Design a protein around this ligand. Structure first.
Ligand SMILES: Cc1cc2nc3c(=O)[nH]c(=O)nc-3n(C[C@H](O)[C@H](O)[C@H](O)COP(=O)(O)OP(=O)(O)OC[C@H]3O[C@@H](n4cnc5c(N)ncnc54)[C@H](O)[C@@H]3O)c2cc1C
Ligand SMILES: Cc1nc2c(=O)[nH]c(=O)nc-2n(C[C@H](O)[C@H](O)[C@H](O)CO)c1C
Ligand code: SF4
Length: 508
């Protein structure tokens, strides 16, 4: 008869959050905290701080307008303890409560902490059911599988959700329409201009606080164009579905110099904090095919990324922590080159990717995978140091998605749990998929010398370094026989060049 305290964290900004469902407005209180612990665990991009705190304050006001009683603690409050647990206690001290109700969060370490808290009232923890597959459902699907393959989990999610399903058949007779026949942009095709969101009043206010109080943090705040509330988020989605979706998948893997968005949806920072719903997004993409406004190959490619990849990696994260975060399968011990932070390198592809991280707190998937992720693998950078960079630079960054993608798909530090094979590549891939190398001072045709592209000698040194480990999986066969036909004086030459590059780059 004292009511409940309902905690809401900065990535839980949904009216349908499980902790808010079943609220008694006359008795309960909602707790929302701007936490310097969370905001400095990594020194997150200036644009991530603005996004989350702008969204939080606006989410708080919408709650108040519905009759909710909201205890909102700002980062300028001088009694703010700084932490979620500290502010839980101080709130329970301020009035009587029957219990604390919360929704499981997206960081194993913080989830583990809150479950252990000694509190003077009971605490109920509810599954986050905004996701389409629960933690328990994933564990059940994975039980007894020797390896975990996304394609098979994706078929399960199509049947469970009914997306692109005509009865019990996949639409168009096939599950997947991905063709390995994709290419760079035509020279005359300029990519469209994307809708950016000018800052509303609340967002402007938080941008000034962040520019003064968090100046030591990575990235530029000028140009902030991310959506901070469901109306702004819905406008982004509308623009993607109407103008971009029909050409999605034609260009999902292309890269173009100083055009950082291309035809991608740019929804991840909003989806990851609750401003959009995964199911609603997919249903509006399906209806676009159903009504003749987009081709099926483009709509399936997009839906695959959300009910397939995004659900798959979260499942892996919760199934395999806390040990997943400690695996270093290739014994990588190198340091991270400084140009990851500064962008000061003559490799035009790396430089363009870091520039986008700095200026927009965003780069698109193939750059995260095949440029900065691939490079870190080949250089042999310690995965702890790669995780720290990815968690800093991107506006969408959370551990449950960053880890399996970075420590798994991009760098094989998990030994193939998420992907199935190292996604290693030489400069020839980047040249095929981009317009970068023509403007690069390096020569993508050469492997040795001071003008050679660093990806070429490094690729082969990586293959040579791990030839034996990679021999036992079986999807790496072409590169191994090609290494096998290499005379020894040819191998020694690239081993020497790759060694030279690691010193040059400040890795070892
Ligand atoms: C090394 C590395 C690190 C990454 N770190 C993150 C991260 O911190 N946070 C993050 O959300 N994604 C991460 N990604 C996945 C992907 O790069 C981003 O989701 C995507 O670039 C966001 O752009 P978008 O919204 O324009 O996506 P689109 O290209 O329009 O794709 C649509 C949606 O699919 C989802 N999605 C696509 N690919 C993935 C993926 N591999 N895993 C999860 N969801 C996916 C997102 O919800 C995305 O908004 C990472 C990928 C790699 C290789
Ligand atoms: C920058 C930031 N700030 C806050 C904050 O001030 N308060 C809060 O409750 N959460 C914040 N978050 C999100 C958490 O740190 C964390 O990553 C998610 O809640 C994962 O569930 C983030 C990422
Ligand atoms: S030559 Fe090498 S470093 Fe230069 S843009 Fe091409 S792949 Fe990148």
């Amino acid at each position: 008869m004292a009511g409940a305290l309902r905690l809401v964290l900065g990535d839980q900004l949904s009216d349908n959050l499980s902790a808010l469902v079943d609220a008694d407005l006359s008795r309960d209180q909602v707790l929302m905290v701007e936490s310097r612990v969370e905001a400095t665990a990594w020194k997150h991009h200036k644009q991530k701080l603005v996004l989350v705190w702008s969204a939080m304050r606006q989410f708080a006001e919408r709650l108040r307008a519905r009759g909710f009683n909201v205890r909102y603690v700002t980062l300028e409050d001088p009694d703010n303890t700084g932490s979620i647990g500290g502010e839980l206690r101080r709130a329970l001290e301020a009035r009587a409560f029957d219990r604390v109700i919360r929704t499981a969060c997206g960081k194993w370490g913080l989830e583990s902490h809150l479950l252990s808290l000694d509190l003077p009232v009971p605490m109920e923890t509810r599954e986050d059911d905004r996701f389409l597959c629960s933690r328990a459902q994933f564990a059940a699907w994975a039980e007894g599988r020797r390896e975990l393959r996304m394609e098979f989990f994706y078929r399960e999610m199509r049947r469970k959700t009914g997306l692109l399903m005509d009865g019990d058949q996949p639409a168009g007779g096939r599950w997947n329409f991905d063709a390995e026949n994709r290419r760079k942009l035509p020279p005359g095709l300029r990519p469209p201009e994307r809708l950016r969101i000018p800052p509303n009043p609340t967002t402007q206010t938080v941008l000034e606080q962040v520019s003064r109080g968090f100046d030591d943090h990575f990235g530029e705040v000028e140009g902030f164009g991310w959506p901070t509330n469901p109306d702004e988020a819905t406008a982004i989605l509308d623009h993607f579905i109407a103008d971009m979706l029909p050409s999605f998948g034609d260009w999902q893997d292309a890269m173009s110099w100083r055009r950082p968005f291309l035809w991608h949806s740019l929804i991840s920072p909003a989806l990851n904090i609750g401003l959009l719903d995964p199911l609603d997004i997919c249903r509006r993409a399906e209806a676009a095919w159903r009504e003749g406004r987009a081709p099926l190959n483009a709509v399936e490619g997009f839906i695959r990324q959300i009910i397939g990849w995004r659900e798959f990696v979260r499942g892996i994260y919760w199934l395999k922590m806390p040990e997943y975060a400690q695996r270093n399968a290739l014994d990588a011990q190198g340091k991270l080159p400084g140009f990851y932070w500064t962008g000061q390198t003559d490799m035009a592809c790396v430089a363009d990717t870091v520039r986008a991280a700095h200026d927009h707190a965003y780069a698109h998937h193939i750059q995260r995978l095949m440029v900065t992720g691939n490079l870190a693998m080949l250089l042999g950078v310690h995965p702890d140091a790669v995780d720290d960079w990815y968690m800093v630079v991107f506006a969408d960054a959370y551990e449950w998605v960053e880890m399996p993608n970075t420590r798994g798909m991009a760098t094989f530090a998990d030994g193939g749990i998420v992907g199935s094979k190292p996604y290693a590549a030489s400069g020839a891939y980047i040249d095929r998929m981009s317009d970068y190398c023509k403007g690069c001072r390096y020569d993508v045709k050469k492997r040795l010398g001071d003008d050679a592209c660093p990806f070429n000698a490094l690729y082969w040194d990586f293959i040579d370094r791990h030839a034996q480990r990679l021999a036992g999986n079986g999807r790496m066969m072409m590169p191994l026989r090609t290494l096998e036909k290499m005379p020894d004086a040819e191998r020694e030459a690239f081993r020497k060049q790759a060694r030279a590059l690691r010193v040059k780059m400040g890795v070892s």
